[model samples]
Target chain A: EPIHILITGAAGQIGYALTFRIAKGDLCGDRKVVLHLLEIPFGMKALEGCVMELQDCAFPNVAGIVWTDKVEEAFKGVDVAFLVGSFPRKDGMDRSDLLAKNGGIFTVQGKALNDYAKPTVKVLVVGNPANTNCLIAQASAPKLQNKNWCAMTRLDHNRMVGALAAKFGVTPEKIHKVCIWGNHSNTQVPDTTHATVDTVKVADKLPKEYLEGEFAQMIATRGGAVIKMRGASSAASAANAALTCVKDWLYGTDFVSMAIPVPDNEPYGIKQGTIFSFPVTVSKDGEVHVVEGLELNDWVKGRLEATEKELIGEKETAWKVLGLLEHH
Target chain B: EPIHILITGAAGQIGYALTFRIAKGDLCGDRKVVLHLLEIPFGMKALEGCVMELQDCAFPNVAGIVWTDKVEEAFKGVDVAFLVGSFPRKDGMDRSDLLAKNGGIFTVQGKALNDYAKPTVKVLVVGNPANTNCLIAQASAPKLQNKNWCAMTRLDHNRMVGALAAKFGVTPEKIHKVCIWGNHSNTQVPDTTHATVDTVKVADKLPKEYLEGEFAQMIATRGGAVIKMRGASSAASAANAALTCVKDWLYGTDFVSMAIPVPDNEPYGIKQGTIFSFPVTVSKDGEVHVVEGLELNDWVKGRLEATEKELIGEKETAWKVLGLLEHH
Candidate 1:
């Protein structure tokens, strides 16, 4: 039987580029996939446009497409869900407002997915505050498999590695031991001190000033740069990252990066119950282990602490909203 | 050195879907291709969103993207171009007006590509009135290769095969020898007699009345059906067809389809020198003839003649407007 996948924000950039690839069997050729797209009612026209091209491609295994504005309608029968769409970020909006908006969306979406999605539904949140927002959604949905819930940070790691590879003029495969610590927010730190661009150490090649300042800012604010240059938000790159995160989790690849989902309790200083982004080793069955025994320098620790503080706040909000905090 | 490919109308359904696949290395994996998207000034927002995704995916092969509205600026250093953007079909405007509008646009584009594009640049036209529009552009250019020119009809063929495949509950790959003949316009013919569906000959399988009437009408008028059902002219399906048409032709796939080009004398009773659609084989060398000694039944003959008559008239109008006829 073919896997039925639901992709929210279907008319958005990531969704726009993604639906075709997933439907056309580019990722898993010969695997039949029926895609259900979720977008606002206003986005349907653009979605319809996207569908026409999918039809044109004449992909052999696509059973059909279903587009809906309602989360319940769009989530039906979906075994794998990519929760990519979120509230748009307008200028002057605070991060807290952004989180709350996405939280509301994710809450409704999570409930629907928990109710109507297929048994094996594995969802990867691509929306912002992805780590915290994912936790909010998970808390809202009483019956969802918590283990199946995750958020995207693999893209951030990929960006760092990509830039590093470019700097050294080597392939991404050559890069190893890099770390993307903390949330998907700007507070996240891409630690390259231990990273190898190919066989050579990346830190050895670059000056400390460029590495710690411009490069870190570049990696952190890459999405903003894309929005500035492209005049919208990041879609293609994010979708690509989300897909890789899933593909690497589902299929086999020898790679290490940050995509670890929240754990109830950990050796890391993160509070017990908050869903957070962490460095993990991934394989075919999803994240294998949240790698242990890393020395956290002051800078990296500060970066993780800031994002974790925010995540802790989100967890409290989620618990409060769900009435879990009051009951406790 | 990477091949920088510029896709005009990059925010369109086809461009969106195709870009994702290309990023995934589905098209040609090893060589990096920086995608430069030229959308309408308004559509840049969407393109911006899409490229955000290209980054997220961390497609190692994708070098970069430059999105813009300026034709000359967009065409610079572009190796392969998919000229899918044009003034979409406007309601109540006759074909001449449509041709004239596109003719003006493409003429400027042709000159731009000739001047600014890489010397080995290859272009495939996907917009309507594709063949003659190609002619207009070619005429405007002082030095453009004959072999690098062709317009789309592969989508029509794919659609025909898809409809047939669904009708018989058969697979697309299973059906072979399906030939699409002549223009991509309403008058073009999708020849099924030469094709076989599931080991059964298309001619024997299809009811003759339906073949001559409903099927042909469906193939011609199906765009309307899609527009009615979806409220847009075909985008994804058209995009798919355009991608396949270009990829198959560029990478050397052994197949035949309908497309418009400059016609030769004594071939299929065509006028000595005119642009018209005909069934031909395409390969890395571009379009080639499979034209000799192919028998046409009287019904097919009359239809081809009628279509040819219309094309000849269009060619005359094109030549006059381009001043080629007067120059001669």
Candidate 2:
């Protein structure tokens, strides 16, 4: 069956890297795709250039491409939406200000989703403050199930794969069941408590101090380190992770980590109503079930709580800014 | 079988875009890959960061990654080489100077391939002025089969696909037998004499004047058009075409276009020993045989002659600059 997929921020570096890969059938499993690329009105010209490049590839799987500035138009019949556009935090900005900026964008996008997209649309937010932005979008789209919405921590998950593989001298495929918790930011906890290498427990193979210290820190701060080295934030890898996120959501049988909003009856003792990262298994039916029963150490538990506090605080601040605190 | 693939200029934009897809099995099917990434001594640090990003993707097909500044080290046991690095034409540089600059780079790379690469190495030149650069590289590596080396005209081929698809109002897969000829540059001919849309001849569907005029011009000049709009040359599409060229060379049954050097026998009879683009078919044994007997119109014949003259002139200049004309 043919599916209509929508991507916002269709002209930026990550978007440019991503649009072609999807056209190549990386996520869709040889199914035909009609891409709907969305950008702000001012970015439409650059988006047109991107479309030119996409057309230049002549990919057979790409049935069609539609470019638009309007969210309603872009989201029409979209089965999967990648909410990637958001305001970057400026030099003088605070956390609350960043949240408010993205909240406004996602709020508008969420209502558009409810009004335009299929109720089963799988939305993955890759913009900064991703978890909060996903939460904002989910809350605004009251009709769409919150379980279908996710914030990207797949980059973190892959970074954990890199860090562990390097330390253990194994490839990423040998490492399984890695988990990421909390936000998509520096505060995110990259947990390997349930992970194994070639069916061997990771903790048994490597030193615990390294796992909690350099390994975890490396996964958390890799984006900044890449910028310091390459003079840009990660683009290609982030785009790769976005594909991995969607590919796994659609077809993978194994547990994968993603930032999913905790319900009012929160699991894992994460604060209620905060979109937090957790290990989840997705079914072919498109249901996302959080993987349960991993034993967290005191250190891991404390780190998760810290990120949860940060997420809750940001949600409160965003609600205050949007005058929606009462709704929360 | 697993293959070791080498890429030069691995820190640049096109290289960054190309690497992950290859790692994801775009070229090698299900076979494993060990990537050898090369940069200049000064570029090794940036190359390290690129490797970091590659690791962050956690690709299973990538068995390992090797990073080096040494050409000999980079080519060790390599099966395929994407010679992607070259001097860009600056404001004051003339054609002869440009050829000489790239000639130096390719000569060294050619020597490296001769010394360390597997004898069966398939080399594709993606650097600027690629046809001539390929000829220079081929001449330097006397032991390597000249047929194993070619330059990228696949980008031009894809641009032609984009152009025709838009004009005919069909997807690229719906179009057939479109071929690029002579060179990868603006002098190249976009030939659709044998092209069909859903088995109907394109010539019958579109006007001859438009095909020879606006449509052909668009394909020839799309690089500059994209650069003008994007403030850079077409990187992602170029990367995509590089994959297409390799994939088709290894496994495709249908006709595809590549800038393969014409032998002294010179089947098309326009010139002898000049690197030129031709429609070719690849066997499962990985041999590229020029697809023969497609009739050309007066306009296409004239355009091919013009590009052949340019390639021959470039070869003469490069040979003179390298003091190899006496040897030739």
Model 1 agreement with the true structure over B1-328: per-residue lDDT tens digits: 8777777778776676567665555555587777768888888777766665565565667666677889888999887788878877689986767777887888888888899888677777877777777777777777776555667788877877777776777656666666666667767876766767777777887797887678878888776766765565565567667777666666655255746455544567766444565666665665455545666777778888877777778867766565565553
* Per-prediction DockQ: 0.39, 0.76
Name the lDDT value of residue A275 in candidate 2.
Answer: 84
Q: Which structure among the candidates has the greatest DockQ?
A: 2
Listed for each candidate, the true contacts retained, as a fraction, are 0.46, 0.67
Error of 1 at A86 (Å): 4.3
Give the Cα-based TM-score of candidate 2 against the true structure: 0.98
Best by lDDT: 2
Please provide TM-scores computed only on chain A for all of the candidate models, following their numbering: 0.90, 0.97
* C-alpha RMSD of candidate 1: 4.2
Candidates' lDDT values, in order? Answer: 0.71, 0.85
Task: Tell me how far the alpha carbon of residue A237 in candidate 2 is from the true structure, in angstroms, after superposition.
Answer: 1.4
- The 10-residue segment with the lowest total lDDT in model 1 chain B: B254-263
